[PDB]
PDB file of all heavy atoms in Angstrom:
ATOM      1  N   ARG A 631      17.599 -85.344   8.329  1.00  0.00           N
ATOM      2  CA  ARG A 631      16.377 -85.899   8.881  1.00  0.00           C
ATOM      3  C   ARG A 631      16.458 -86.157  10.372  1.00  0.00           C
ATOM      4  O   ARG A 631      15.523 -85.828  11.097  1.00  0.00           O
ATOM      5  CB  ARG A 631      16.040 -87.202   8.150  1.00  0.00           C
ATOM      6  CG  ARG A 631      14.856 -87.968   8.690  1.00  0.00           C
ATOM      7  CD  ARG A 631      14.915 -89.423   8.272  1.00  0.00           C
ATOM      8  NE  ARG A 631      16.130 -90.074   8.740  1.00  0.00           N
ATOM      9  CZ  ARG A 631      16.890 -90.869   7.996  1.00  0.00           C
ATOM     10  NH1 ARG A 631      16.565 -91.113   6.736  1.00  0.00           N
ATOM     11  NH2 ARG A 631      17.977 -91.416   8.511  1.00  0.00           N
ATOM     12  N   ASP A 632      17.563 -86.711  10.861  1.00  0.00           N
ATOM     13  CA  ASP A 632      17.706 -87.031  12.272  1.00  0.00           C
ATOM     14  C   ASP A 632      18.273 -85.870  13.073  1.00  0.00           C
ATOM     15  O   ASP A 632      18.333 -85.939  14.302  1.00  0.00           O
ATOM     16  CB  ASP A 632      18.577 -88.270  12.450  1.00  0.00           C
ATOM     17  CG  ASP A 632      17.930 -89.511  11.916  1.00  0.00           C
ATOM     18  OD1 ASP A 632      16.689 -89.546  11.841  1.00  0.00           O
ATOM     19  OD2 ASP A 632      18.662 -90.453  11.561  1.00  0.00           O
ATOM     20  N   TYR A 633      18.691 -84.800  12.410  1.00  0.00           N
ATOM     21  CA  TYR A 633      19.172 -83.652  13.159  1.00  0.00           C
ATOM     22  C   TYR A 633      18.319 -82.412  12.921  1.00  0.00           C
ATOM     23  O   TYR A 633      17.802 -81.826  13.875  1.00  0.00           O
ATOM     24  CB  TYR A 633      20.637 -83.377  12.827  1.00  0.00           C
ATOM     25  CG  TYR A 633      21.182 -82.165  13.525  1.00  0.00           C
ATOM     26  CD1 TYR A 633      21.167 -82.075  14.905  1.00  0.00           C
ATOM     27  CD2 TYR A 633      21.703 -81.108  12.810  1.00  0.00           C
ATOM     28  CE1 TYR A 633      21.649 -80.970  15.543  1.00  0.00           C
ATOM     29  CE2 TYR A 633      22.183 -79.999  13.442  1.00  0.00           C
ATOM     30  CZ  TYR A 633      22.158 -79.935  14.806  1.00  0.00           C
ATOM     31  OH  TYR A 633      22.646 -78.824  15.435  1.00  0.00           O
ATOM     32  N   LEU A 634      18.141 -82.007  11.665  1.00  0.00           N
ATOM     33  CA  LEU A 634      17.449 -80.751  11.402  1.00  0.00           C
ATOM     34  C   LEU A 634      15.942 -80.921  11.475  1.00  0.00           C
ATOM     35  O   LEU A 634      15.247 -80.122  12.107  1.00  0.00           O
ATOM     36  CB  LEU A 634      17.849 -80.191  10.040  1.00  0.00           C
ATOM     37  CG  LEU A 634      19.257 -79.655   9.834  1.00  0.00           C
ATOM     38  CD1 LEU A 634      19.393 -79.182   8.405  1.00  0.00           C
ATOM     39  CD2 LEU A 634      19.565 -78.552  10.809  1.00  0.00           C
ATOM     40  N   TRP A 635      15.413 -81.939  10.801  1.00  0.00           N
ATOM     41  CA  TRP A 635      13.978 -82.186  10.821  1.00  0.00           C
ATOM     42  C   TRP A 635      13.511 -82.667  12.184  1.00  0.00           C
ATOM     43  O   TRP A 635      12.468 -82.236  12.682  1.00  0.00           O
ATOM     44  CB  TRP A 635      13.608 -83.203   9.744  1.00  0.00           C
ATOM     45  CG  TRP A 635      12.144 -83.472   9.639  1.00  0.00           C
ATOM     46  CD1 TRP A 635      11.218 -82.711   9.015  1.00  0.00           C
ATOM     47  CD2 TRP A 635      11.447 -84.612  10.146  1.00  0.00           C
ATOM     48  NE1 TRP A 635       9.982 -83.290   9.104  1.00  0.00           N
ATOM     49  CE2 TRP A 635      10.099 -84.463   9.795  1.00  0.00           C
ATOM     50  CE3 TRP A 635      11.836 -85.745  10.859  1.00  0.00           C
ATOM     51  CZ2 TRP A 635       9.136 -85.393  10.144  1.00  0.00           C
ATOM     52  CZ3 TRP A 635      10.883 -86.661  11.203  1.00  0.00           C
ATOM     53  CH2 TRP A 635       9.548 -86.486  10.844  1.00  0.00           C
ATOM     54  N   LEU A 636      14.267 -83.573  12.795  1.00  0.00           N
ATOM     55  CA  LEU A 636      13.801 -84.224  14.008  1.00  0.00           C
ATOM     56  C   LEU A 636      13.797 -83.267  15.194  1.00  0.00           C
ATOM     57  O   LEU A 636      12.825 -83.201  15.951  1.00  0.00           O
ATOM     58  CB  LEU A 636      14.658 -85.448  14.298  1.00  0.00           C
ATOM     59  CG  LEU A 636      14.179 -86.221  15.509  1.00  0.00           C
ATOM     60  CD1 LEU A 636      12.790 -86.737  15.235  1.00  0.00           C
ATOM     61  CD2 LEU A 636      15.098 -87.350  15.771  1.00  0.00           C
ATOM     62  N   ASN A 637      14.879 -82.509  15.379  1.00  0.00           N
ATOM     63  CA  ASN A 637      14.961 -81.584  16.508  1.00  0.00           C
ATOM     64  C   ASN A 637      14.424 -80.211  16.115  1.00  0.00           C
ATOM     65  O   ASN A 637      14.950 -79.165  16.486  1.00  0.00           O
ATOM     66  CB  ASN A 637      16.391 -81.475  17.011  1.00  0.00           C
ATOM     67  CG  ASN A 637      17.052 -82.807  17.172  1.00  0.00           C
ATOM     68  OD1 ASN A 637      16.818 -83.510  18.145  1.00  0.00           O
ATOM     69  ND2 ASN A 637      17.880 -83.170  16.219  1.00  0.00           N
ATOM     70  N   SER A 638      13.287 -80.221  15.440  1.00  0.00           N
ATOM     71  CA  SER A 638      12.655 -78.972  15.053  1.00  0.00           C
ATOM     72  C   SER A 638      11.214 -79.001  15.510  1.00  0.00           C
ATOM     73  O   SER A 638      10.571 -77.959  15.587  1.00  0.00           O
ATOM     74  CB  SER A 638      12.722 -78.758  13.547  1.00  0.00           C
ATOM     75  OG  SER A 638      13.971 -78.230  13.161  1.00  0.00           O
ATOM     76  N   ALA A 639      10.726 -80.192  15.858  1.00  0.00           N
ATOM     77  CA  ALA A 639       9.327 -80.417  16.178  1.00  0.00           C
ATOM     78  C   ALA A 639       8.863 -79.665  17.410  1.00  0.00           C
ATOM     79  O   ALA A 639       7.696 -79.270  17.468  1.00  0.00           O
ATOM     80  CB  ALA A 639       9.089 -81.906  16.385  1.00  0.00           C
ATOM     81  N   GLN A 640       9.740 -79.440  18.378  1.00  0.00           N
ATOM     82  CA  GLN A 640       9.414 -78.686  19.578  1.00  0.00           C
ATOM     83  C   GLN A 640       9.561 -77.192  19.371  1.00  0.00           C
ATOM     84  O   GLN A 640       8.799 -76.413  19.944  1.00  0.00           O
ATOM     85  CB  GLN A 640      10.329 -79.119  20.722  1.00  0.00           C
ATOM     86  CG  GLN A 640      10.149 -80.544  21.169  1.00  0.00           C
ATOM     87  CD  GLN A 640       8.781 -80.799  21.716  1.00  0.00           C
ATOM     88  OE1 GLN A 640       7.967 -81.483  21.098  1.00  0.00           O
ATOM     89  NE2 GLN A 640       8.513 -80.258  22.898  1.00  0.00           N
ATOM     90  N   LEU A 641      10.543 -76.794  18.566  1.00  0.00           N
ATOM     91  CA  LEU A 641      10.784 -75.387  18.275  1.00  0.00           C
ATOM     92  C   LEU A 641       9.645 -74.775  17.478  1.00  0.00           C
ATOM     93  O   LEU A 641       9.118 -73.726  17.852  1.00  0.00           O
ATOM     94  CB  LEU A 641      12.109 -75.260  17.526  1.00  0.00           C
ATOM     95  CG  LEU A 641      12.507 -74.044  16.695  1.00  0.00           C
ATOM     96  CD1 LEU A 641      12.853 -72.849  17.516  1.00  0.00           C
ATOM     97  CD2 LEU A 641      13.677 -74.469  15.868  1.00  0.00           C
ATOM     98  N   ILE A 642       9.236 -75.424  16.389  1.00  0.00           N
ATOM     99  CA  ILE A 642       8.226 -74.853  15.507  1.00  0.00           C
ATOM    100  C   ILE A 642       6.827 -75.007  16.066  1.00  0.00           C
ATOM    101  O   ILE A 642       5.887 -74.400  15.546  1.00  0.00           O
ATOM    102  CB  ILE A 642       8.345 -75.489  14.118  1.00  0.00           C
ATOM    103  CG1 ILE A 642       7.949 -76.961  14.177  1.00  0.00           C
ATOM    104  CG2 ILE A 642       9.752 -75.351  13.638  1.00  0.00           C
ATOM    105  CD1 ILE A 642       8.068 -77.673  12.893  1.00  0.00           C
ATOM    106  N   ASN A 643       6.663 -75.803  17.114  1.00  0.00           N
ATOM    107  CA  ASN A 643       5.427 -75.871  17.871  1.00  0.00           C
ATOM    108  C   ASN A 643       5.463 -74.966  19.090  1.00  0.00           C
ATOM    109  O   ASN A 643       4.690 -75.173  20.027  1.00  0.00           O
ATOM    110  CB  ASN A 643       5.150 -77.312  18.280  1.00  0.00           C
ATOM    111  CG  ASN A 643       4.319 -78.043  17.272  1.00  0.00           C
ATOM    112  OD1 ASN A 643       3.149 -77.739  17.080  1.00  0.00           O
ATOM    113  ND2 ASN A 643       4.927 -79.000  16.595  1.00  0.00           N
ATOM    114  N   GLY A 644       6.367 -73.985  19.098  1.00  0.00           N
ATOM    115  CA  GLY A 644       6.410 -73.025  20.187  1.00  0.00           C
ATOM    116  C   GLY A 644       5.146 -72.201  20.276  1.00  0.00           C
ATOM    117  O   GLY A 644       4.701 -71.834  21.360  1.00  0.00           O
ATOM    118  N   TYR A 645       4.569 -71.874  19.130  1.00  0.00           N
ATOM    119  CA  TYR A 645       3.198 -71.390  19.055  1.00  0.00           C
ATOM    120  C   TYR A 645       2.546 -72.087  17.873  1.00  0.00           C
ATOM    121  O   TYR A 645       3.146 -72.196  16.804  1.00  0.00           O
ATOM    122  CB  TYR A 645       3.126 -69.869  18.942  1.00  0.00           C
ATOM    123  CG  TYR A 645       3.829 -69.249  17.764  1.00  0.00           C
ATOM    124  CD1 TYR A 645       3.151 -68.954  16.595  1.00  0.00           C
ATOM    125  CD2 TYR A 645       5.172 -68.923  17.837  1.00  0.00           C
ATOM    126  CE1 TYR A 645       3.791 -68.377  15.537  1.00  0.00           C
ATOM    127  CE2 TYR A 645       5.815 -68.344  16.786  1.00  0.00           C
ATOM    128  CZ  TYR A 645       5.127 -68.074  15.640  1.00  0.00           C
ATOM    129  OH  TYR A 645       5.790 -67.498  14.592  1.00  0.00           O
ATOM    130  N   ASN A 646       1.367 -72.620  18.096  1.00  0.00           N
ATOM    131  CA  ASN A 646       0.593 -73.361  17.117  1.00  0.00           C
ATOM    132  C   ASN A 646      -0.845 -72.854  17.221  1.00  0.00           C
ATOM    133  O   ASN A 646      -1.077 -71.940  18.016  1.00  0.00           O
ATOM    134  CB  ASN A 646       0.820 -74.865  17.345  1.00  0.00           C
ATOM    135  CG  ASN A 646       0.447 -75.329  18.721  1.00  0.00           C
ATOM    136  OD1 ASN A 646      -0.101 -74.594  19.526  1.00  0.00           O
ATOM    137  ND2 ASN A 646       0.764 -76.573  19.006  1.00  0.00           N
ATOM    138  N   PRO A 647      -1.823 -73.329  16.447  1.00  0.00           N
ATOM    139  CA  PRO A 647      -3.196 -72.834  16.638  1.00  0.00           C
ATOM    140  C   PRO A 647      -3.881 -73.255  17.931  1.00  0.00           C
ATOM    141  O   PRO A 647      -5.050 -72.909  18.115  1.00  0.00           O
ATOM    142  CB  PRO A 647      -3.933 -73.428  15.431  1.00  0.00           C
ATOM    143  CG  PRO A 647      -2.924 -73.654  14.450  1.00  0.00           C
ATOM    144  CD  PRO A 647      -1.731 -74.080  15.182  1.00  0.00           C
ATOM    145  N   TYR A 648      -3.199 -73.961  18.828  1.00  0.00           N
ATOM    146  CA  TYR A 648      -3.775 -74.426  20.077  1.00  0.00           C
ATOM    147  C   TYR A 648      -3.237 -73.708  21.302  1.00  0.00           C
ATOM    148  O   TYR A 648      -3.913 -73.686  22.329  1.00  0.00           O
ATOM    149  CB  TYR A 648      -3.545 -75.930  20.220  1.00  0.00           C
ATOM    150  CG  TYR A 648      -3.875 -76.644  18.942  1.00  0.00           C
ATOM    151  CD1 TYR A 648      -2.888 -77.266  18.198  1.00  0.00           C
ATOM    152  CD2 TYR A 648      -5.173 -76.659  18.457  1.00  0.00           C
ATOM    153  CE1 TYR A 648      -3.187 -77.898  17.016  1.00  0.00           C
ATOM    154  CE2 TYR A 648      -5.483 -77.287  17.276  1.00  0.00           C
ATOM    155  CZ  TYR A 648      -4.488 -77.907  16.560  1.00  0.00           C
ATOM    156  OH  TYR A 648      -4.799 -78.541  15.383  1.00  0.00           O
ATOM    157  N   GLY A 649      -2.038 -73.142  21.230  1.00  0.00           N
ATOM    158  CA  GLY A 649      -1.557 -72.290  22.296  1.00  0.00           C
ATOM    159  C   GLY A 649      -0.109 -71.881  22.161  1.00  0.00           C
ATOM    160  O   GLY A 649       0.491 -72.041  21.100  1.00  0.00           O
ATOM    161  N   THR A 650       0.470 -71.369  23.249  1.00  0.00           N
ATOM    162  CA  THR A 650       1.851 -70.898  23.277  1.00  0.00           C
ATOM    163  C   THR A 650       2.527 -71.477  24.504  1.00  0.00           C
ATOM    164  O   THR A 650       1.992 -71.371  25.610  1.00  0.00           O
ATOM    165  CB  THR A 650       1.964 -69.367  23.358  1.00  0.00           C
ATOM    166  OG1 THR A 650       1.679 -68.940  24.690  1.00  0.00           O
ATOM    167  CG2 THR A 650       1.005 -68.708  22.480  1.00  0.00           C
ATOM    168  N   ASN A 651       3.678 -72.101  24.310  1.00  0.00           N
ATOM    169  CA  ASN A 651       4.563 -72.386  25.428  1.00  0.00           C
ATOM    170  C   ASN A 651       5.703 -71.370  25.492  1.00  0.00           C
ATOM    171  O   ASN A 651       5.658 -70.348  24.808  1.00  0.00           O
ATOM    172  CB  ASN A 651       5.018 -73.850  25.364  1.00  0.00           C
ATOM    173  CG  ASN A 651       5.821 -74.177  24.138  1.00  0.00           C
ATOM    174  OD1 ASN A 651       6.169 -73.317  23.359  1.00  0.00           O
ATOM    175  ND2 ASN A 651       6.101 -75.451  23.950  1.00  0.00           N
ATOM    176  N   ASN A 652       6.712 -71.619  26.325  1.00  0.00           N
ATOM    177  CA  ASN A 652       7.818 -70.683  26.482  1.00  0.00           C
ATOM    178  C   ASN A 652       8.815 -70.741  25.334  1.00  0.00           C
ATOM    179  O   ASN A 652       9.767 -69.955  25.321  1.00  0.00           O
ATOM    180  CB  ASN A 652       8.539 -70.936  27.805  1.00  0.00           C
ATOM    181  CG  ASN A 652       9.056 -72.349  27.926  1.00  0.00           C
ATOM    182  OD1 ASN A 652       8.365 -73.308  27.597  1.00  0.00           O
ATOM    183  ND2 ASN A 652      10.278 -72.486  28.406  1.00  0.00           N
ATOM    184  N   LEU A 653       8.629 -71.650  24.385  1.00  0.00           N
ATOM    185  CA  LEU A 653       9.423 -71.700  23.171  1.00  0.00           C
ATOM    186  C   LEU A 653       8.855 -70.813  22.080  1.00  0.00           C
ATOM    187  O   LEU A 653       9.278 -70.925  20.930  1.00  0.00           O
ATOM    188  CB  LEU A 653       9.517 -73.136  22.661  1.00  0.00           C
ATOM    189  CG  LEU A 653      10.358 -74.132  23.450  1.00  0.00           C
ATOM    190  CD1 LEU A 653      10.593 -75.367  22.624  1.00  0.00           C
ATOM    191  CD2 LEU A 653      11.671 -73.524  23.885  1.00  0.00           C
ATOM    192  N   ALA A 654       7.888 -69.958  22.412  1.00  0.00           N
ATOM    193  CA  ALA A 654       7.253 -69.102  21.420  1.00  0.00           C
ATOM    194  C   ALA A 654       8.215 -68.053  20.891  1.00  0.00           C
ATOM    195  O   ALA A 654       8.199 -67.738  19.696  1.00  0.00           O
ATOM    196  CB  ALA A 654       6.017 -68.443  22.020  1.00  0.00           C
ATOM    197  N   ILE A 655       9.062 -67.503  21.759  1.00  0.00           N
ATOM    198  CA  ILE A 655      10.050 -66.535  21.304  1.00  0.00           C
ATOM    199  C   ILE A 655      11.140 -67.210  20.490  1.00  0.00           C
ATOM    200  O   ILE A 655      11.675 -66.619  19.554  1.00  0.00           O
ATOM    201  CB  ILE A 655      10.603 -65.734  22.497  1.00  0.00           C
ATOM    202  CG1 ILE A 655      11.552 -64.637  22.018  1.00  0.00           C
ATOM    203  CG2 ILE A 655      11.265 -66.647  23.509  1.00  0.00           C
ATOM    204  CD1 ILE A 655      10.999 -63.715  20.970  1.00  0.00           C
ATOM    205  N   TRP A 656      11.454 -68.461  20.779  1.00  0.00           N
ATOM    206  CA  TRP A 656      12.459 -69.132  19.976  1.00  0.00           C
ATOM    207  C   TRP A 656      11.923 -69.506  18.604  1.00  0.00           C
ATOM    208  O   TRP A 656      12.653 -69.400  17.622  1.00  0.00           O
ATOM    209  CB  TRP A 656      12.992 -70.338  20.741  1.00  0.00           C
ATOM    210  CG  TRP A 656      13.720 -69.924  21.989  1.00  0.00           C
ATOM    211  CD1 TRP A 656      13.384 -70.241  23.263  1.00  0.00           C
ATOM    212  CD2 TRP A 656      14.893 -69.103  22.078  1.00  0.00           C
ATOM    213  NE1 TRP A 656      14.267 -69.678  24.141  1.00  0.00           N
ATOM    214  CE2 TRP A 656      15.205 -68.972  23.438  1.00  0.00           C
ATOM    215  CE3 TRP A 656      15.710 -68.469  21.140  1.00  0.00           C
ATOM    216  CZ2 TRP A 656      16.296 -68.235  23.884  1.00  0.00           C
ATOM    217  CZ3 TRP A 656      16.788 -67.745  21.582  1.00  0.00           C
ATOM    218  CH2 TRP A 656      17.081 -67.644  22.940  1.00  0.00           C
ATOM    219  N   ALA A 657      10.641 -69.862  18.501  1.00  0.00           N
ATOM    220  CA  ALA A 657      10.004 -70.035  17.199  1.00  0.00           C
ATOM    221  C   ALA A 657       9.940 -68.730  16.421  1.00  0.00           C
ATOM    222  O   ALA A 657      10.206 -68.707  15.210  1.00  0.00           O
ATOM    223  CB  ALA A 657       8.600 -70.593  17.384  1.00  0.00           C
ATOM    224  N   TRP A 658       9.616 -67.634  17.103  1.00  0.00           N
ATOM    225  CA  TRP A 658       9.550 -66.331  16.462  1.00  0.00           C
ATOM    226  C   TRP A 658      10.922 -65.870  15.984  1.00  0.00           C
ATOM    227  O   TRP A 658      11.037 -65.321  14.892  1.00  0.00           O
ATOM    228  CB  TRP A 658       8.938 -65.328  17.431  1.00  0.00           C
ATOM    229  CG  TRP A 658       8.356 -64.113  16.798  1.00  0.00           C
ATOM    230  CD1 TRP A 658       7.140 -64.011  16.210  1.00  0.00           C
ATOM    231  CD2 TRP A 658       8.951 -62.817  16.717  1.00  0.00           C
ATOM    232  NE1 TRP A 658       6.939 -62.741  15.759  1.00  0.00           N
ATOM    233  CE2 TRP A 658       8.039 -61.985  16.058  1.00  0.00           C
ATOM    234  CE3 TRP A 658      10.170 -62.282  17.132  1.00  0.00           C
ATOM    235  CZ2 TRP A 658       8.302 -60.651  15.807  1.00  0.00           C
ATOM    236  CZ3 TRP A 658      10.430 -60.966  16.876  1.00  0.00           C
ATOM    237  CH2 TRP A 658       9.502 -60.162  16.223  1.00  0.00           C
ATOM    238  N   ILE A 659      11.975 -66.109  16.766  1.00  0.00           N
ATOM    239  CA  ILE A 659      13.328 -65.713  16.384  1.00  0.00           C
ATOM    240  C   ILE A 659      13.880 -66.633  15.298  1.00  0.00           C
ATOM    241  O   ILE A 659      14.657 -66.205  14.445  1.00  0.00           O
ATOM    242  CB  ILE A 659      14.220 -65.672  17.640  1.00  0.00           C
ATOM    243  CG1 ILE A 659      13.878 -64.449  18.476  1.00  0.00           C
ATOM    244  CG2 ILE A 659      15.702 -65.624  17.314  1.00  0.00           C
ATOM    245  CD1 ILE A 659      14.669 -64.348  19.722  1.00  0.00           C
ATOM    246  N   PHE A 660      13.464 -67.900  15.291  1.00  0.00           N
ATOM    247  CA  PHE A 660      13.777 -68.811  14.195  1.00  0.00           C
ATOM    248  C   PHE A 660      13.241 -68.272  12.872  1.00  0.00           C
ATOM    249  O   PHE A 660      13.972 -68.166  11.875  1.00  0.00           O
ATOM    250  CB  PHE A 660      13.156 -70.162  14.542  1.00  0.00           C
ATOM    251  CG  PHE A 660      13.608 -71.307  13.707  1.00  0.00           C
ATOM    252  CD1 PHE A 660      14.921 -71.708  13.707  1.00  0.00           C
ATOM    253  CD2 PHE A 660      12.694 -72.030  12.970  1.00  0.00           C
ATOM    254  CE1 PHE A 660      15.313 -72.779  12.965  1.00  0.00           C
ATOM    255  CE2 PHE A 660      13.089 -73.099  12.228  1.00  0.00           C
ATOM    256  CZ  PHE A 660      14.398 -73.473  12.228  1.00  0.00           C
ATOM    257  N   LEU A 661      11.970 -67.868  12.869  1.00  0.00           N
ATOM    258  CA  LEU A 661      11.370 -67.283  11.674  1.00  0.00           C
ATOM    259  C   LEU A 661      11.971 -65.924  11.340  1.00  0.00           C
ATOM    260  O   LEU A 661      12.125 -65.577  10.168  1.00  0.00           O
ATOM    261  CB  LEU A 661       9.870 -67.149  11.869  1.00  0.00           C
ATOM    262  CG  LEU A 661       9.005 -68.377  11.667  1.00  0.00           C
ATOM    263  CD1 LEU A 661       7.600 -67.899  11.743  1.00  0.00           C
ATOM    264  CD2 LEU A 661       9.294 -69.048  10.350  1.00  0.00           C
ATOM    265  N   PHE A 662      12.294 -65.137  12.361  1.00  0.00           N
ATOM    266  CA  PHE A 662      12.942 -63.845  12.192  1.00  0.00           C
ATOM    267  C   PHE A 662      14.303 -63.989  11.527  1.00  0.00           C
ATOM    268  O   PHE A 662      14.630 -63.224  10.619  1.00  0.00           O
ATOM    269  CB  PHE A 662      13.033 -63.198  13.579  1.00  0.00           C
ATOM    270  CG  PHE A 662      13.822 -61.929  13.649  1.00  0.00           C
ATOM    271  CD1 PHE A 662      13.199 -60.712  13.488  1.00  0.00           C
ATOM    272  CD2 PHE A 662      15.170 -61.945  13.966  1.00  0.00           C
ATOM    273  CE1 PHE A 662      13.907 -59.553  13.589  1.00  0.00           C
ATOM    274  CE2 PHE A 662      15.884 -60.786  14.051  1.00  0.00           C
ATOM    275  CZ  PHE A 662      15.254 -59.591  13.867  1.00  0.00           C
ATOM    276  N   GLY A 663      15.092 -64.977  11.940  1.00  0.00           N
ATOM    277  CA  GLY A 663      16.362 -65.234  11.298  1.00  0.00           C
ATOM    278  C   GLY A 663      16.223 -65.716   9.875  1.00  0.00           C
ATOM    279  O   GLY A 663      17.020 -65.341   9.017  1.00  0.00           O
ATOM    280  N   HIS A 664      15.208 -66.538   9.601  1.00  0.00           N
ATOM    281  CA  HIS A 664      14.917 -66.918   8.218  1.00  0.00           C
ATOM    282  C   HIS A 664      14.587 -65.704   7.364  1.00  0.00           C
ATOM    283  O   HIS A 664      15.037 -65.598   6.217  1.00  0.00           O
ATOM    284  CB  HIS A 664      13.749 -67.885   8.180  1.00  0.00           C
ATOM    285  CG  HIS A 664      14.119 -69.291   8.494  1.00  0.00           C
ATOM    286  ND1 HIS A 664      14.151 -69.776   9.779  1.00  0.00           N
ATOM    287  CD2 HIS A 664      14.432 -70.328   7.693  1.00  0.00           C
ATOM    288  CE1 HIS A 664      14.486 -71.049   9.754  1.00  0.00           C
ATOM    289  NE2 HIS A 664      14.662 -71.407   8.503  1.00  0.00           N
ATOM    290  N   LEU A 665      13.810 -64.776   7.917  1.00  0.00           N
ATOM    291  CA  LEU A 665      13.445 -63.559   7.204  1.00  0.00           C
ATOM    292  C   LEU A 665      14.667 -62.702   6.909  1.00  0.00           C
ATOM    293  O   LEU A 665      14.835 -62.218   5.792  1.00  0.00           O
ATOM    294  CB  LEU A 665      12.414 -62.782   8.019  1.00  0.00           C
ATOM    295  CG  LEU A 665      11.982 -61.395   7.564  1.00  0.00           C
ATOM    296  CD1 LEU A 665      11.234 -61.480   6.259  1.00  0.00           C
ATOM    297  CD2 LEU A 665      11.126 -60.762   8.622  1.00  0.00           C
ATOM    298  N   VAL A 666      15.541 -62.513   7.898  1.00  0.00           N
ATOM    299  CA  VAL A 666      16.716 -61.658   7.713  1.00  0.00           C
ATOM    300  C   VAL A 666      17.682 -62.288   6.714  1.00  0.00           C
ATOM    301  O   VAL A 666      18.268 -61.605   5.866  1.00  0.00           O
ATOM    302  CB  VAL A 666      17.398 -61.385   9.065  1.00  0.00           C
ATOM    303  CG1 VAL A 666      18.585 -60.483   8.906  1.00  0.00           C
ATOM    304  CG2 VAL A 666      16.453 -60.764   9.991  1.00  0.00           C
ATOM    305  N   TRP A 667      17.844 -63.607   6.793  1.00  0.00           N
ATOM    306  CA  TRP A 667      18.686 -64.334   5.856  1.00  0.00           C
ATOM    307  C   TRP A 667      18.163 -64.243   4.429  1.00  0.00           C
ATOM    308  O   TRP A 667      18.941 -64.156   3.478  1.00  0.00           O
ATOM    309  CB  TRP A 667      18.760 -65.778   6.306  1.00  0.00           C
ATOM    310  CG  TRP A 667      19.759 -66.619   5.648  1.00  0.00           C
ATOM    311  CD1 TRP A 667      21.066 -66.694   5.943  1.00  0.00           C
ATOM    312  CD2 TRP A 667      19.523 -67.561   4.601  1.00  0.00           C
ATOM    313  NE1 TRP A 667      21.672 -67.620   5.152  1.00  0.00           N
ATOM    314  CE2 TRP A 667      20.741 -68.168   4.316  1.00  0.00           C
ATOM    315  CE3 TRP A 667      18.391 -67.950   3.881  1.00  0.00           C
ATOM    316  CZ2 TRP A 667      20.869 -69.135   3.343  1.00  0.00           C
ATOM    317  CZ3 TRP A 667      18.520 -68.913   2.935  1.00  0.00           C
ATOM    318  CH2 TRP A 667      19.744 -69.502   2.674  1.00  0.00           C
ATOM    319  N   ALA A 668      16.844 -64.313   4.254  1.00  0.00           N
ATOM    320  CA  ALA A 668      16.266 -64.141   2.927  1.00  0.00           C
ATOM    321  C   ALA A 668      16.421 -62.711   2.425  1.00  0.00           C
ATOM    322  O   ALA A 668      16.640 -62.491   1.232  1.00  0.00           O
ATOM    323  CB  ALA A 668      14.803 -64.535   2.957  1.00  0.00           C
TER     324      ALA A 668
END
């Protein structure tokens, strides 16, 4: 909760329905790694 959940709020908001910051590629690669791992 204090490590994985807490320090994820900025990463997964790299792109949201309101816009994109420069963490958009890190959110995309986070999801990409989840996909490859699955």
Side-chain angles (χ1 to χ4, degrees):
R631 175 201 59 225
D632 293 335
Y633 178 58
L634 290 179
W635 183 80
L636 183 63
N637 313 281
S638 278
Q640 295 297 109
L641 161 73
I642 68 182
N643 269 292
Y645 59 95
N646 58 7
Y648 314 113
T650 76
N651 63 7
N652 57 316
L653 289 194
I655 185 53
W656 295 118
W658 201 81
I659 286 179
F660 193 63
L661 280 187
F662 173 92
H664 280 87
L665 173 66
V666 181
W667 191 82

